[PDB]
């Protein structure tokens, strides 16, 4: 005959790969990004009944969302707030998916790829601003310490006794 | 030099795809079914020694066991009680296995292929039944909310 | 547009395969061995910046260290006290790796090749010894 995979209730998590996309961050940087969907057919009748091929349907919304999301996202959110991204991804994608009887469990972004050379520059320049921050922030702490210090030196001079009554309950 | 993988004690679980068996359910439905065997070599001497190739031999008892177990099971069992199957599979296999010094830890049926079209048939029928049922309950629920509201109504009429 | 894989603070463990090393054991047995390196990136900036390619470079010192640890080990350790060698490797390698921002969590020896037929011999003879200590314990009891 002709055989076909049975759509039965899932016991262990099924895993689907979302194909690479090219799209631009909000931010303005072109990127290629792919990711992984973890799901479990919870109601096979809906999965068979409500979409033609739920595997491909899920594959679709997955791309649409991953595209969309990156659209409204700063380069930095892809490189640095995965946890929040994937969570954002699970949320939208699980929801979309329930008409079809699929529970989406997690959706973690797999690899992110950027224009070549870019991350070297981005590495160098962040190394540079990490320092330039250390400078200013410190130079600041000090300018202020200097102020409060000069301020206590005035009070101590004008009020010789001010350090006494405080020393007198030790 | 010519070398060979050595049969060591397994620190982690090895995995082994069981080749598809196609066969008839008790039920009488034609079926393509395959499984993953999880295992660990536990006595490497036994394993190198009692069986020419232990990976091969595990593949075949697994194959044969699965074929038998499927022939015993009713279609619905494969679809809805996979877990029970899965478990006897592990029992029967791990045993068969023991002479060769292997621990089979789990054995999990992977994909069951039905003859095509059969499943759409069942789903659509399934959907139609829930669709019927829901029409009834809706009316029974409406009707009764009506009456509880009707008897809500006397109480406030005859007694303000 | 030609792209590259962004280094990021890994959330879930990465997995490197150490290519095969053919070498002799301390025992003098010739042997093909290999290993998996489990690791997370912890400081991208370290990793992009300190070293031309963090992968090639972890793979290299992973080879070198695998090579050495073997030469220092007795065949039977290789097959029988893998754990010890495993940890050994973890320690050396994680270390090497910090200049680059990488936490190496485990290194595990995967497949081990001996010359064709040698285990088939070690196996026969080691079973002989069990047919020995099993009868020197059934004429001693009764």
From Swiss-Prot, chain C:
Q: What is this protein called?
A: Stomatin homolog PH1511
Positions the record marks as coiled coil are: 71-98
> Could you name the Gene Ontology cellular component terms for this entry?
plasma membrane
Listed A to Z, the keywords are:
Coiled coil, Membrane, Transmembrane, Transmembrane helix
The record's subcellular locations are: Membrane
Q: Note the residue range shown relative to the complete protein.
A: 56 to 196 of 266
Report the principal subcellular site: membrane
Known partners and oligomeric status: Homotrimer. Interacts with PH1510 and is cleaved by PH1510.
The membrane-topology field of this record reads: Single-pass membrane protein
The family note in this entry says: Belongs to the band 7/mec-2 family.
